[PDB]
From a paper:
The Omicron variant of [name]-[name]-2 carries multiple unusual mutations, particularly in the receptor-binding domain (RBD) of the spike (S) protein. There are 15 amino acid (AA) substitutions in the receptor binding domain (RBD) of the S protein, nine of which are located at the binding interface of the [name]-[name]-2 RBD and human [name] (hACE2) receptor, namely K417N, G446S, S477N, E484A, Q493R, G496S, Q498R, N501Y, and Y505H. Receptor binding is the key step for [name]-[name]-2 infection. Omicron BA.1 was found to display a broader host range than the prototype, whereas the Delta variant showed no alteration.
In addition, neither the prototype RBD nor Delta RBD interacts with mACE2, but Omicron BA. RBD binds to mACE2 (14.23 ± 6.22 nM) with a higher binding affinity than that of hACE2 (18.2 ± 1.33 nM). Consistent with the flow cytometry and SPR assays, mouse, rat and least horseshoe bat [name] were found to initiate the entry of Omicron BA.1 pseudovirus, but not prototype pseudovirus. The S protein of Omicron BA.1 was found to comprise 30 AA substitutions (15 on the RBD), six AA deletions and three AA insertions. From the complex structure, only one RBD was observed in the open conformation binding to mACE2, while the other two RBDs in the S protein were closed. Numerous mutations on the surface of the S protein were observed, which may enable Omicron BA.1 to escape immune surveillance obtained from natural infection or vaccination. The mouse is also regarded as a potential host of the Omicron variant, and it has been hypothesized that the Omicron variant is a mouse-adapted virus. Notably, two key mouse-adapted mutations, Q493R and Q498R, had not been previously reported in any other [name]-[name]-2 variant before the discovery of Omicron, suggesting that mice are potentially the original host of Omicron.
Residue numbers in the entry:
A (entry chain D): 317 to 416
B (entry chain B): 15 to 68, 77 to 142, 153 to 176, 185 to 210, 215 to 247, 257 to 297
C (entry chain A): 298 to 676, 690 to 695
D (entry chain C): 447 to 496
């Protein structure tokens, strides 16, 4: 709704959004993996709480940031400084948390 | 390819074509009418070159012209096919018509023709070493005490190669007969010379008697007669004598 | 009409030739022979093993009938980019031959197959001319040409000394030297192989999924063209004055069963005046006779306009059963249909006479109709005798 | 590149002399209606010189 591209179809297929039932174990840590070759995934357990809502938005900011530099020769696909990565997800979380 | 130096050469003979070589100019039906046409015909009472093979052996590279009338009195099909082209080698593009045991095959390519191409039931051929680059191929039903008279007319105009044909159970006989159209090919190539193809049988070799005749077409005016069933039954050559 | 023909407001006693009569056909027949010469398609499209982009597969297509109407049953592909002609029902052209090239590329290099484009494929693998006529069709093959461990079969060129000429293909495996020292045939420093792999995996995005690309190029040479396209046909109607087209023979008239026995190779037929009067249907091999639709002349029999305004009409050389009946417009007479059933239709060897009563008496001739028949104004009415 | 110039490519019939058509409707290529959205068998009639 702000002017960002829509997510890929495979993003919703390769991403874990709910805790597995049985047979698999997850380290229980929210991560946003950039697998490579245009592959992006979110690994986290999502619960019914605004804490999980804020964490999901924070990881979604990282997801938007990571795909935003997919057009670089594998050496510029980072940030200019180490602070840009965690700054992107903070503003989105703050804006969505406003009472309006 | 193989070379057999056993030829018995004698000069080609000359004989008379009386009224042979009339074909249907087009595909229009006309009934009980007299129609005047101007086209490439073999003039009446003309000189035609005569070759015979029995050991008689001769396969000259005769020159092509506005068109060719080909005749063969034969039995058991010693003569099989033809080659058309300009240089008869791999430098230029040549057309080849072969009469298989069961199908006629037409191919235009850059063949490498030997000095003596011929066939030798026998299923061996000595014509070309390889086909370089082919742009047309066609296959269909075969074209073919002396008993068999085969008459052919070959024309090459506006990129189309036309073959008219007639077969008769029988030098050249008296009478009239019109050659119905047989084949039209959009080859779109240039032809300047041609050379016949015989099939030998090794038993050295023994070959049966056969004769073939070559004549050349020229532009002329004819008056043709169509009977009730659209058949050409008679013709008049307007430039032969005062009476015509 | 008589007044306009005579350029006067008064007419004297007599018979005058005014205009003509026609039939004005309806509907069209477009019969063409059976469409039985299958294009070599379904083998370069529905194939099972394509080739590399640097070794793209080439096929030559000739002496067939193009069938550009089955591609709508193909994948949901969005790439049908056509240059030189428009793809909107414009496949009726005839070409001497068609060259079809096929290869497989990545999802992001589909735009590189176009004239005036630079990149890796366009400069080292596949170069297209500026005057390229034809078009490119690319469809996704994610579910068939991808491997979980990686499809390392397809390859491409990465390093070349110079660009590629249009319609050029090189399969040399020479080592590309970037430095200033001889390679000696070993891959050491400043020397790398020019060929690399794609390693397709199904988990990749749309930009890395394999895409199968086929390029059609049309040639128009001085040799006769033999690749044309589907020739459609209507159904034929007989005993009705219609327009018709038979293998390019155009005309108008009535088609009927014919007793003529054509020779097997003959297509048309002509009469002694050299006009087409018979035809052969290309699909079903029988003979149809052709007859022109009815036509003739019209003469107006009138007494003086000083006497009356009644007239009679003679249709010349016309049987009275083919007299105009009309619906709205099938007759070149300017729609002055005269009553037929109740207006004393009479038949003479000169034609059909309408508007006059035939009597059994005999008088001296007043207005000559012909063949011993005259007309007069007596009693008051117009009579023929 | 100037894209301000457009011209028509797809039309049902040839145009009569001295007629001006400014119809922006999506040309019906396929039998199924385009419903006012371009795509497969649905192309914008006007394209640019560029
Ligand atoms: C053109 O195709 C039609 C297809 O129907 C052919 O018509 C059929 O011909 C067969 C003979 O093989 C008959 O048994 C059928 O009854 C015919 N059906 C119809 C509807 O006509 C027709 O013969 C073909 N023409 C040519 C020249 O091949
Ligand atoms: C054999 O070769 C000679 C010359 O090498 C040539 O004149 C001749 O035509 C060839 N063929 C036969 C059958 O002699
Ligand atoms: C045919 O050729 C012969 C030579 O054998 C010649 O004498 C004659 O004049 C030519 N023409 C005719 C009509 O015989
Ligand atoms: C037709 O020609 C081929 C070679 O082109 C040959 O193998 C085949 O035997 C021939 N057909 C017959 C019936 O002999
Ligand atoms: C094969 O011959 C045709 C006709 O001459 C020609 O157009 C074509 O370019 C030739 N093929 C090659 C590869 O040169
Ligand atoms: C055949 O005719 C064409 C057309 O003029 C010409 O280009 C070609 O050179 C001719 N063939 C030869 C062998 O010269
Ligand atoms: C012509 O056709 C008729 C059939 O009407 C047939 O009787 C006759 O034999 C055919 N040939 C000739 C020469 O009349
Ligand atoms: C490929 O197969 C499909 C299967 O339905 C068919 O519809 C399509 O026409 C085929 N492709 C070609 C080029 O014939
Ligand atoms: C006119 O048509 C009728 C009806 O078929 C027919 O009986 C008659 O012979 C034809 N000719 C004349 C002069 O009446
Ligand atoms: Zn974060």
């Amino acid at each position: 709704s702000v002017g960002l591209p829509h997510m890929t179809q495979g993003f919703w297929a390769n991403s874990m959004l709910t805790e597995p039932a049985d047979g698999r174990k997850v380290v229980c840590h929210p991560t946003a993996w950039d697998l490579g070759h245009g592959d992006f995934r979110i690994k986290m357990c999502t619960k019914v709480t605004m804490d999980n809502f804020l964490t999901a938005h924070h990881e979604m900011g990282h997801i938007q940031y990571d795909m935003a530099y997919a057009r670089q020769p594998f050496l510029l696909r980072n940030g200019a400084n180490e602070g840009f990565h965690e700054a992107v997800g903070e503003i989105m979380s703050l804006s969505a948390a406003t009472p309006k | 390819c193989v070379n057999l130096t056993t030829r018995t050469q004698l000069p080609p003979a000359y004989t008379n074509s009386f009224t042979r070589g009339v074909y249907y100019p087009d595909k229009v039906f006309r009934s009980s009418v007299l129609h005047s046409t101007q086209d490439l015909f073999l003039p009446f009472f003309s000189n035609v070159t005569w070759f015979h093979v029995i050991k008689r052996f001769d396969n000259p590279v005769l020159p092509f012209n506005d068109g060719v009338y080909f005749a063969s009195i034969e039995k058991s099909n010693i003569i099989r096919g033809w080659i058309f082209g300009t240089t008869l080698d791999s430098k230029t593009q040549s057309l080849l018509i072969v009469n298989n045991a069961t199908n006629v095959v037409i191919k235009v390519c850059e063949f490498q023709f030997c000095n003596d191409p011929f066939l030798d039931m026998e299923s061996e051929f000595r014509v070309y070493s390889s086909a370089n680059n082919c742009t047309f191929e066609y296959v269909s039903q075969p074209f073919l005490n002396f008993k068999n008279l085969r008459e052919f007319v070959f024309k090459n105009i506006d990129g189309y190669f036309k073959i008219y044909s007639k077969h008769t159970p029988i030098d050249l006989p008296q009478g009239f007969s019109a050659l119905e159209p047989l084949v039209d090919l959009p080859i779109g190539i240039n032809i300047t010379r041609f050379q016949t193809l015989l099939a030998l049988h090794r038993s050295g070799w023994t070959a049966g008697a056969a004769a073939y005749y070559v004549g050349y077409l020229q532009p002329r005016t004819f008056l043709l007669k169509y009977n009730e069933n659209g058949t050409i039954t008679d013709a008049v050559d307007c430039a032969l004598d005062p009476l015509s | 009409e008589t007044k306009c023909t005579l350029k006067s407001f008064t007419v004297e006693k007599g018979i005058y030739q005014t205009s003509n009569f026609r039939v004005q056909p309806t509907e069209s027949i477009v019969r063409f022979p059976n469409i039985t010469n299958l294009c070599p398609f379904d083998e370069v499209f529905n194939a099972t093993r394509f080739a590399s982009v640097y070794a793209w597969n080439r096929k030559r297509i000739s002496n067939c009938v193009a069938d550009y109407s089955v591609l709508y049953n193909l994948a949901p592909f969005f790439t049908f980019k056509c240059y030189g002609v428009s793809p909107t029902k414009l496949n009726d052209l005839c070409f001497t031959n068609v060259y079809a090239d096929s290869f497989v590329i990545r999802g992001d290099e589909v735009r590189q197959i176009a004239p005036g484009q630079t990149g890796n494929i366009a400069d080292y693998n596949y170069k297209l001319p500026d005057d390229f006529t034809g078009c490119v069709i690319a469809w996704n093959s994610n579910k068939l040409d991808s491997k979980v461990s990686g499809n390392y079969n397809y390859l491409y060129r990465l390093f070349r000394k110079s660009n590629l000429k249009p319609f050029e293909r090189d399969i040399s495996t020479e080592i590309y030297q970037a430095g200033n020292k001889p390679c000696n045939g070993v891959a050491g420093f400043n020397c790398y192989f020019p060929l690399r792999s794609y390693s397709f995996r199904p988990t990749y995005g749309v930009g890395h999924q394999p895409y199968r690309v086929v390029v059609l190029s049309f040639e128009l040479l001085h040799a006769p063209a033999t690749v044309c396209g589907p020739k459609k046909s209507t159904n034929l109607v007989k005993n009705k004055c219609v327009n018709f087209n038979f293998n390019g023979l155009k005309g108008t008239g009535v088609l009927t069963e014919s007793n003529k026995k054509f020779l097997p190779f003959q297509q048309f037929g002509r009469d002694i005046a050299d006009t087409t009067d018979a035809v052969r249907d290309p699909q079903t091999l029988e003979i149809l006779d052709i007859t022109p639709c009815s036509f003739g002349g019209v003469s107006v029999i009138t007494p003086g306009t000083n006497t009356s305004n009644q007239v009679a009409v003679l249709y010349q050389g016309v049987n009275c059963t083919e007299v105009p009946v009309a619906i709205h417009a099938d007759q070149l007479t300017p729609t002055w249909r005269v009553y037929s059933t109740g207006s004393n239709v009479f038949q003479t060897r000169a034609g059909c006479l309408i508007g006059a009563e035939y009597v059994n008496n005999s008088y001296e001739c007043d207005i000559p109709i012909g063949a011993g028949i005259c007309a007069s104004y007596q009693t008051q009415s117009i009579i023929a005798y």
